[PDB]
Design a protein around this ligand. Structure first.
Ligand SMILES: [Co+2]
Ligand SMILES: [Co+2]
Length: 295
């Protein structure tokens, strides 16, 4: 298909990912880094497929700063940086952990290694469970635990998560077989904790999921804006902050939520507050090898 796109998106992804790494310095204010990255995506001809995620230490995914966030990077922090950019709808979702002001530690290695292992065996005609088995074994062999309740996702145009998962564990029933042209995001997560993650407030990322009618005026606007500018792809609370004052927006969003026009993606924290590491690449399933659009 338009692999030229998926690839071109991966390309921006990679590139902005690298700079992201470089900007992530101790002292760096979280809100800024977010914006710098997000602004570069665009500046490269890209469009964010979703808010850049900067999850620190025990919080694993779904945390994106906001206008008002005073979080700053302390030396020693395990900053996982997840970036995603789309071109006309083709996604490149790539991620990396960075130990603020220090070198890659054994944990991060476990994750990075897991990813490789998944990648190396991904090819047409193989059950996902093999991937998950590969990932699991590398993280456990080194002493950590793979986050069980977080997984990779199949990707489709203007669809960040198609519906098929590549978990970071081996389950005998994950029998989906890789088909040529399939494009997947493989994302192992590792931790020193229980190996499980749980939803936690606040919720900073939302996704429009259904065109339903809303009674309140602000909501119908918010919604109409959301639908227009964002579409199927996840958006940040932060992005809607310069449209309407906090208290209102808050309501706007909440209302759309109760109605069911957008889904809330809460922040995820390890159940035992165990540091979490992560690495991810987008792969386009070929017949003999896969092709890492983002590395
Ligand atoms: Co990602
Ligand atoms: Co992903």
């Amino acid at each position: 298909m338009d692999t030229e796109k998926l690839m071109k998106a991966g390309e921006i992804a990679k590139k902005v990912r690298e700079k992201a790494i470089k900007l992530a310095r101790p002292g760096m204010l979280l809100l800024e880094l977010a914006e710098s990255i997000e602004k570069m995506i665009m500046e490269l001809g890209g469009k964010p497929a979703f808010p850049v995620n900067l999850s620190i230490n025990e919080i694993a995914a779904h945390y994106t700063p906001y206008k008002g966030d005073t979080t700053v990077l302390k030396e020693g922090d395990y900053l996982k940086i997840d970036v995603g950019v789309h071109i006309d709808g083709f996604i490149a979702d790539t991620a990396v952990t960075v130990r603020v002001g220090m070198e890659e530690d054994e944990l991060m290695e476990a994750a990075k290694e897991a990813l490789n292992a998944a990648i190396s065996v991904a090819r047409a005609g193989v059950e996902i469970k093999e991937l998950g088995k590969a990932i699991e074994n590398e993280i456990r062999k080194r002493g950590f635990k793979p986050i069980v309740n977080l997984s990779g996702h199949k990707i489709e145009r203007y669809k960040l998560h198609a519906g098929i998962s590549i978990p970071n564990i081996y389950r005998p029933h994950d029998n989906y077989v890789l088909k040529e042209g399939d494009v997947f995001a493989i994302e192992p997560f590792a931790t020193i904790g229980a190996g499980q993650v749980i939803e936690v407030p606040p919720t900073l990322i939302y996704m429009y999921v259904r065109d339903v009618p809303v009674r309140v005026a602000q909501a119908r606007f918010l919604l109409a804006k959301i639908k227009r500018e964002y579409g199927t792809l996840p958006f940040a609370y932060r992005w809607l902050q310069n449209d309407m004052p906090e208290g209102q927006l808050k309501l706007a969003l909440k209302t759309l939520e109760k109605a069911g026009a957008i889904y809330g993606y809460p922040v995820l924290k390890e159940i035992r507050n165990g540091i979490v590491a992560q690495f991810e690449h987008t792969i386009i399933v070929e017949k003999d090898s896969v092709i890492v659009t983002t590395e």
